[PDB]
Amino acid sequence: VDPRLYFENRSKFIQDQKDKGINPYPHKFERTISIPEFIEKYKDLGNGEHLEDTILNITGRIMRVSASGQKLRFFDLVGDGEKIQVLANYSFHNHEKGNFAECYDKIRRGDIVGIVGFPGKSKKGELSIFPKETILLSACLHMLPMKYGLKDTEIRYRQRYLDLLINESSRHTFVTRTKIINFLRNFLNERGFFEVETPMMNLIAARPFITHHNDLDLDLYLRIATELPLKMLIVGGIDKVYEIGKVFRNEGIDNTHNPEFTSCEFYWAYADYNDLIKWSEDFFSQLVYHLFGTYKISYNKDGPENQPIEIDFTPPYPKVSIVEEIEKVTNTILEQPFDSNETIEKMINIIKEHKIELPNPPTAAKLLDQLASHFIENKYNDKPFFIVEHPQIMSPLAKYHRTKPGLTERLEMFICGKEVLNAYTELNDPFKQKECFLDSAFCTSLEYGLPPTGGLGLGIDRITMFLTNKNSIKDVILFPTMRPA
Amino acid sequence: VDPRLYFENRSKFIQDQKDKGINPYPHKFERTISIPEFIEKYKDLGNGEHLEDTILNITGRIMRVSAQKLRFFDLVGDGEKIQVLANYSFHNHEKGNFAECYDKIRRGDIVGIVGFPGKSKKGELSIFPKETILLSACLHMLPMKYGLKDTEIRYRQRYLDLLINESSRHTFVTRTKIINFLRNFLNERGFFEVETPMMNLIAGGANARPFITHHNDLDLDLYLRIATELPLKMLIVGGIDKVYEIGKVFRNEGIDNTHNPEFTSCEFYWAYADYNDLIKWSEDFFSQLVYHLFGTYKISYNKDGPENQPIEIDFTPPYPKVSIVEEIEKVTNTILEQPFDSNETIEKMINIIKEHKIELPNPPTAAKLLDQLASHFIENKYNDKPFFIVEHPQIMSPLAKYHRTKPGLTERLEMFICGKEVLNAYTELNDPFKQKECFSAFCTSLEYGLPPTGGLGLGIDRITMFLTNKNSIKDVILFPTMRPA
Ligand SMILES: O=C(NCC1(O)CCC(F)(F)CC1)c1cc(=O)c2cc(F)ccc2o1
Ligand SMILES: O=C(NCC1(O)CCC(F)(F)CC1)c1cc(=O)c2cc(F)ccc2o1
């Protein structure tokens, strides 16, 4: 091919057109209808039917060019993810506005054009615009990749625009993401929740990103969660409150982790465990039904080259008590307290015998996390499920379980072995909140009285992955965090 | 009453309750109605009328303790208020001693009441308890009725502002309604909401130092975005023809009453739109937003603070359009000959600034001089209606398409409310051969073909300030970043 030459020559064309008094980047073309609107309005035409008296102005990007016949030229025109044909017939051209062949020979794949013409269908039944006049609105100076010729993630994740133009499923993925967020926002708002914005950077502060604030001469931390200020709003009497926005984790990158991701966190005064579980079941089932018209979906867990599985979002979903289950499968009691030297040693021994990676550092909470990932988190690939009743030492903001000492009223929901949701009743007794005696501001706010409250957070990117059949978070974030090329 | 001793005694109370087998922070109280729903259901009851057969569970925060045999409180929830009338006559004596129960209650305590609806003889809608449970105690003395004018406290303990100042909750409810109105306005027009990166590889801009941070695993310096403009334009190239984002942008600069280093913007791009379409979108949005909130286009604003008379701002469209160079030349009795960056015109501008005893921008570039002249001579032109400043010079507007009829100018508009910029918009300069930056990821995307496009940005915080009658931007941000205590 030689793309460099293609580009040099198209740049010369631009200059050339300008020499003839043609602006290949003109100011304004007044369109009368969009491509989706045109398809909706004309899709019932009969084969070969022309509405020669209906004159429309339309725009779009040319994505295919062909001819045979100097006097009959055909293009694909795309707009808003939809497509029509352009049938340029010598006889329908306005010859006073220019030479036909000259007008149409200069069009290349990628060009954005403005068409004045009439609607009809080809004898084959393809919905088409029949131009009297076609003008360039903006040129494509590069050779675009061919359809099915853009697989390189280095280009798709950086030059996302090329991915959107060439890979049809890419636009669908990002459409689905926005419909998920719209669904959630509406779901919450119909339940009386009040959306807010809290600060993206905090004084005191998951390993954080740090940034210097010039006006205050302070080094501040990007938020890792929106939890603290939301709870302060509950204290303030906003009894159902939430935020949907970005949080930042200066950690690793992989198929389920990006350094900024979008969370939805809500707090719900006077709610319990049971309300959070029901919320979760209601929300997931109703979202999937909204998107798909069924509770069951297909997901390629092990990639596009292997057979998919079915994930069923029909509620209710299984609940697995983390400690009881670890103890059962390992036939070992993890005696409380879980951070005793003896119980730590026991967890390390189990980890050592199953050749599970020892975490670093090997703290009781991280040991319990590793045990759960090994023995439980992959238990159910065919339905979402909750891991519940986590130890206090894993869950310092969660209220004590009312009948299982040492545990909490916490739930964490997993889809195919990946965490997408964490929720719990908030520990609201300041004399039991060990992290006070945590941002000193939080501690203080508890002393003014936090009602009994339930809190919940969702990972919007991971949810989108499952509902768009993607195996990497990079495929559901328009511009994922990447080093320069 | 001494605040330290008050707190110490409430802490001692908590522990004494626990020592008597009472949990002053119980897990769950199951409420059956909210305070707003209660007011709505029972507001028509005849005086002194009781529905003693309707047993309800209600919760709220006690905000007044009036009150033997008969105890009176104010109970608040969701920004509304009812009376509590606790009568010995109706108390469930099985559950506890009437005076022991009600003697323990203090202003700010959150409580759960089992009781019945009625009005008092005197006419006051009330809940009548049979039983009252502490759900979460206020350990501190709450500031009273007024007496929380202190901005430090309102901004550092926003929860106290929200509990004590009725107008606080209103300000922030209004803010959420503005954003909701905007999202819906856009969505009904076919715009598609996206999230672009908070962290990018662009080291700020000409008038905006960046927040800098660093991802440790990548070993990569990153910068907080100063605007969403670049990725949104790339999505226009990618065929998302009407695209927007509402979220935070970051400029690591000084703080004042109209500038916060983190602030909320909405930016949209609209392919195939012009100048005039952006003017009209602006008049439609502002007028309809104000009508939506107030039921009139005319609002009152204390431009000179609460201690001075307000002015009326009329949002009835259309709004005035003032051409920047023409108006400077008129008010200043000068002619500013192009090019505006000639030593002569620079000299003329510098001398106007000196002679008027206006601070001279440093360095004195043509764009900065023009900026200073507009700010002094034109940005206060109208205070009784919003207005547009239009047709900025190319030299001040390097991403704006050239004006079709006036040499050296652009298709740009900025809207001002009481001398403050709330919107900036223009037709995008899309010929890469005319974009001065293209001697970049921008310039590469322009080479693939950006259609003729209109772009617009709104300052959400400043718009909220005017629609909530605030003079400082910290008044419309829940938790603004403050110099630590
Ligand atoms: O969705 C995710 N996690 C699930 C949640 O923990 C998310 C927060 C919650 F919504 F509150 C509860 C459920 C997630 C996505 C990432 O890209 C990511 C990146 C990191 F560097 C570190 C953690 C990360 O976590
Ligand atoms: O609302 C503001 N400006 C108006 C806009 O320029 C906002 C960006 C646009 F929306 F795209 C077009 C209109 C504003 C608010 C601040 O708090 C602020 C702080 C700074 F450090 C620097 C500039 C700032 O500007």
Author numbering:
A (entry chain A): 78 to 282, 287 to 518, 535 to 582
B (entry chain B): 78 to 144, 147 to 518, 537 to 582
Manuscript excerpt for this entry:
Aminoacyl-tRNA synthetases catalyze aminoacylation of tRNAs with their cognate amino acids in two stages. First, the amino acid is activated by ATP to yield the AMP-activated amino acid, with loss of pyrophosphate, followed by transfer of the amino acid onto the tRNA. Malaria parasite genomes encode two different lysyl-tRNA synthetases (KRSs) that play a role in translation in either the cytoplasm (PfKRS1) or in the apicoplast (PfKRS2), while Cryptosporidium parasites and humans encode one copy. We present a selective inhibitor of both Plasmodium and Cryptosporidium lysyl-tRNA synthetase capable of clearing parasites from mouse models of malaria and cryptosporidiosis infection.
Addition of fluorines on the 4-position of the cyclohexyl ring in 5 was tolerated and led to excellent metabolic stability, both in mouse and human liver microsomes. The complex of 5 bound to PfKRS1 showed that the addition of the difluoro moiety on the cyclohexyl ring had minimal effect upon the position of the ligand within the binding site with respect to 4, and there was no evidence of protein rearrangement. In this complex, all polar interactions were retained, although the H-bond between the bridge-head OH and the side chain of Glu-500 had shortened to 3.0 Å. Compound 5 was active against both PfKRS1 (IC50 = 0.015 μM) and whole-cell bloodstream P. falciparum 3D7 (EC50 = 0.27 μM) and was selective compared with both the HsKRS (IC50 = 1.8 μM) and HepG2 cells (EC50 = 49 μM). Under our experimental conditions, results showed a linear competitive inhibition vs. ATP with a Ki of 32 nM and a linear uncompetitive inhibition vs. l-lysine with a Ki of 212 nM. These results indicate that compound 5 competes with ATP for the same binding site and only binds in the presence of l-lysine, also suggesting a sequential ordered kinetic mechanism where l-lysine is the first substrate to bind. Molecular dynamics (MD) simulations were successful in reproducing the binding pose and interactions of compound 5 observed in the co-crystal structure of PfKRS1. In addition to those interactions, the inhibitor was found to be stabilized by hydrophobic contacts established between the cyclohexyl moiety and the bound substrate l-lysine. Simulations performed in the absence of l-lysine showed a notable destabilization of compound 5, suggesting a key role of l-lysine in the binding of PfKRS1 inhibitors. In apo-PfKRS1, due to the smaller size of V328 and S344 side chains, the ligand binding pocket remained accessible to compound 5.
